[PDB]
Amino acid sequence: AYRDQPLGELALSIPRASALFRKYDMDYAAGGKQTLARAAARKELDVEVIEAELAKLAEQPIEKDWRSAPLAEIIDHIIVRYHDRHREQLPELILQATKVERVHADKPSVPKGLTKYLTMLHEELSSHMMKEEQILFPMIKQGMGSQAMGPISVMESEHDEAGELLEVIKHTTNNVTPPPEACTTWKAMYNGINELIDDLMDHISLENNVLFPRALAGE
Ligand SMILES: [Cl-]
Ligand SMILES: [O]
Ligand SMILES: [Zn+2]
Ligand SMILES: [Zn+2]
């Protein structure tokens, strides 16, 4: 009964479901409590077809399941797999976008504003991740997860803001689709943007859907 399940649980229980939800622009990361039914209905999508596709993915080799993993292990995974990679990814994308916007300034397809939006994302995500690393993650490791309502509500609000920047980035780049006349830098940059989006949604999903609720529950 997949349509009646929350998007968060689906993304965390079925491998490559994340990419499927990315394809349909369903926010399993910050909107992970919403049922598939409501998500699909809002987008005028055929939920039976989506239920079928999830079933196909569900037959595949059962991946690493973070839902019951120890919180300290989730934390260490986040820091290394996501926070450190974002800190490397964003500066590079910023350089590339600066070049693309300059070199192709005359083209109507140029993603005007992209450098600015990536710069904002980098600045905001950097300060956010530092707060997590300095206070929230240590407090959870030190058994104070049940006391983290304050920081968690702020971090979740900031996750929603990161989502809004991702939407603006997607809009500016025609849903990260390079035009016919794009060359190697522009195409490679769009591949990097898709990778950043994929990673950031999975990162936010792991925080919002696993780490934060389990921490508050005293696990
Ligand atoms: Cl190019
Ligand atoms: O984060
Ligand atoms: Zn984080
Ligand atoms: Zn976060």
Number of domains in the chain: 1
Buried b (16+ CB within 10 A) or exposed e, 129-167: beebeeebbeebeeeebeebeebbeebeebbebbbebbe
Find out whether 1 and 195 touch, Cβ atoms under 8 Å.
Answer: no
CA of 207 to the centre of ligand 1 (A): 35
At residue 189's C-alpha, the angle toward residues 185 and 193, to 5°, is: 175
Nearest to 137 by CA among 203, 191, 187: 203
Expressed in angstroms and rounded, the spacing between residue 90 Cα and the centre of ligand 1 is 18
Ligand nearest to the CA of 189: 1
Cα-based distances in Å from 207 to 3, 8, 125:
23, 11, 14
Technique that determined the structure: X-ray
Kindly provide the resolution of this structure in angstroms, with one decimal.
Answer: 1.8
Give φ, ψ of 107 to 5 degrees. Answer: -85, 135
Dist CA 180 CA 113 (whole Å): 20
What DSSP string describes 199-214? Answer: HHHHHHHHIIIIIHHH
Q: Which domain holds residue 94?
A: 1-219
Q: Give, as residue ranges, everything with CB less than 5 Å from ion ligand 4.
A: 155, 207
- Tell me which ligand sits closest to the C-alpha of residue 101: 1
Q: Which residues line ligand 2 (CB under 6 A)?
A: 128-129, 132, 203, 207
Ligand 4 centroid to residue 186 C-alpha, Å: 28
DSSP for 28-73, written as a single string: TTTSTTSBHHHHHHHTT--HHHHHHHHHHHHHS-----GGGS-HHH
Question: Which residue's CA is the nearest one to ligand 2's atom 1?
Answer: 129
Q: How far apart are CA 169 and CA 101, in angstroms?
A: 14
3-state secondary structure (DSSP) of residue 193: helix
Q: How far is the CA of 106 from the centre of ligand 3 (A)?
A: 38
